[PDB]
């Protein structure tokens, strides 16, 4: 904690500050890019921003797309991982690692938020549940 | 891409020659359009899209 | 589009359960048809005991039997037996040898012809169908004498358990045509025993080589046929297993499916509306 | 091309002149059917004239239905398909043959727009893309 944020917008939000904690986050470990050090942040299950941004989104009354979602919820995550970045020597050489995290129902990588994200990051770490299951710990498919 | 298409055009009809035109993922000039007709008042046409998809 | 799954489910799951018939099927004629195939394996002994054991003895003639199942389902069992045939039939292969290859069971005639195919004679099939019988053995052991070679080769699976039939090739040699003369060193070993046959011993061999290969043979389609019914038990112990996991990736689809047609229904409904108020 | 017309709209004309084109088409094709002569009408892709009329109809604020389609989009395609006949002699004895070409998307026939013109027509070619590549060319099922 010596070298931690930790940024929380809980269970019980409000679906606006669920909606806006992960950019909240990424303000401030974009100081840490921008003034020439490196950043690291972990958006712990980004699929429940996108379903904080879903409840706001209908409670809007703006059109529902593919599984619910609004249509620009491929933006929120997209302007979100953007962001981090490794910046040039004439912009202080700062960089910012991002861990979005994205919880899968029952393996089905084929999912709109999950097909978002993964076209947005440069790769992934999938963990997979028989391999959970049989102890294989971290179950890196 | 309409950009992207005008500096492919210029190539196409002035120098008149032939152009290569690469577009990564012309789908999200569809999804964009999609964004962007939710608040223009439309009604929206299958799974989510603009009428004039 | 959601109804081809649905009936895609109902296939894979009526295969599943027929595949689990099956296996219990299987294991059912496995049990029932191995307290007569330890009970024929007594009578090999004293052929083995008397004759002994000569697989590479150089023939001139030379008869080979595959003994392989009829029905199909038993997971590469005659293929294995098809493949052990050229790998014992080339192993006799030292003078240009002439060889007849004969297939016991039909899924063998079928498998010889496309590695030997000019060496192929006869094809004895419908052998499961009722039970084996030591007549029928005899049988065969007749149509094999009618042509008569130096020597024998009987291939099958011996029904060690449940789990393992690693196979066998049992070798039966023709009276004094070739199998005395694999006897004598110093003087002989048959020469031990009194021959108490009402003629020569050239044809006390002569019978006791006709009834050694009905008993080879015998038993050879009789431990096949239990090895058989254990490979089917194991083969479709996997079938369930795959129409199992097939069937669930399936359901998975499924749920998949149905909750995006009430989400898509829902969708249009709201749509609806909105545009009249 | 003697005996050709070719009426031509395609993805960059507006809305309306794709809704319309197979009307358009049907009346140039009427004239041979009403004076004695004999008519072969393909409209390719009804269910490209279908679309063009479901942006016109959403457009226009008229309230969607089936996958967003207005409620008159069977008597869209009815009061087209109708209008190829056999006239009886006393008209003349002239024809009109009708190829309505309809895609589907998976095979799946049970959609809106293809269930509509399967009950409007009276037989059905039915090409599959599993025949397609078996070798079995045309495809038909």
Same mark, same amino acid.
């Given at each position: ?9 809980? &269970? ?8 806006? &904690?992960?950019?909240? /986050? ?9 003034? /020439? ?27 529902? /797309? ?40 029952? /393996? ?34 | ?53 | ?9 109902? +296939? ?9 018939? *099956?296996? *219990? ?5 496995? @049990? ?23 697989? +590479? ?24 037996? =098809?493949?052990? =045939? ?28 496309? %590695?030997?195919?000019? !060496?192929?004679?006869?094809? %004895? ?73 009402? $003629?020569? !011993? ?9 009834? $050694? ?15 058989? $019914? ?18 669930? @990736? ?12 009430? =989400? ?5 409904? %709201? ?5 009249? *108020?």
């Amino acid at each position: 904690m010596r070298y931690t944020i930790m940024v929380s917008a809980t &269970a019980s939000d409000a679906a606006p500050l669920q909606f806006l &904690a992960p950019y909240s /986050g990424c303000a401030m470990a974009e100081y840490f890019r921008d003034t /020439g050090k490196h950043g690291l942040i972990i958006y712990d299950d980004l699929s429940k921003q996108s379903v904080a941004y879903r409840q706001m989104s209908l409670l809007l009354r703006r059109p529902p /797309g593919r599984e619910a979602f609004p249509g620009d919820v491929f933006y929120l995550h997209s302007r979100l991982l953007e962001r981090a970045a490794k910046l040039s020597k004439e912009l202080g050489g700062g960089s910012l690692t991002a861990f979005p995290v994205i919880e899968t129902q029952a /393996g089905d990588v084929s999912a709109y938020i999950a097909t978002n994200v993964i076209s947005i990051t440069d790769g992934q770490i999938f963990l997979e549940t028989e391999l959970f299951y049989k102890g294989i710990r971290p179950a890196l498919n | 891409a309409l950009t992207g298409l005008t500096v492919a055009e210029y190539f196409r009809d002035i120098e008149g020659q032939d152009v290569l035109l690469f577009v990564d993922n012309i789908f999200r000039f569809t999804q964009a359009n999609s964004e962007v007709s939710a608040l223009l008042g439309r009604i929206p046409s299958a799974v989510g899209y603009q009428p004039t998809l | 589009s959601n109804q081809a799954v649905k009936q895609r489910i109902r +296939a894979i799951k009526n295969i599943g359960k027929i595949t689990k018939a *099956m296996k *219990m099927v299987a294991a059912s004629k496995m @049990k029932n048809a191995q307290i007569a195939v330890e009970q024929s394996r007594g009578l090999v002994d004293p052929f083995v005991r008397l004759f002994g054991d000569f697989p +590479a003895v150089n023939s001139n003639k030379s008869v080979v039997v595959a003994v392989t199942s009829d029905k199909g389902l038993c997971g590469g069992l005659n293929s294995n037996i =098809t493949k052990y =045939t050229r790998a014992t039939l080339a192993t006799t292969e030292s003078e240009g040898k002439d060889v007849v290859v004969v297939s016991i069971g039909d899924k063998g005639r079928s498998q010889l012809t496309r %590695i030997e195919s000019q !060496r192929y004679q006869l094809a %004895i099939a419908d052998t499961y169908k009722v039970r084996v019988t030591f007549g029928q053995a005899s049988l065969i052991v007749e149509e094999l004498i009618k042509h008569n070679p130096q020597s024998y080769q009987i291939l099958f699976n011996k029904f060690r358990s449940a789990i393992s039939f690693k196979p066998t090739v049992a070798t039966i040699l023709s009276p004094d045509l070739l199998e005395k003369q694999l006897e004598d060193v110093t003087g002989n070993s048959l020469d031990a025993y009194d021959i108490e046959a009402s $003629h020569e !011993r050239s044809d006390v061999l002569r019978d006791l080589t006709e009834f $050694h290969l009905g008993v080879t043979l015998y038993n050879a389609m009789l431990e096949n046929n239990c090895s058989e $019914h254990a490979s089917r038990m194991s083969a479709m112990e996997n079938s369930t297993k795959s129409a199992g996991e097939m069937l669930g @990736k399936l359901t998975l689809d499924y749920n998949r499916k149905r909750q995006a047609t009430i =989400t898509t229904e829902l969708i249009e409904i %709201i749509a609806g509306a909105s545009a009249l *108020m």
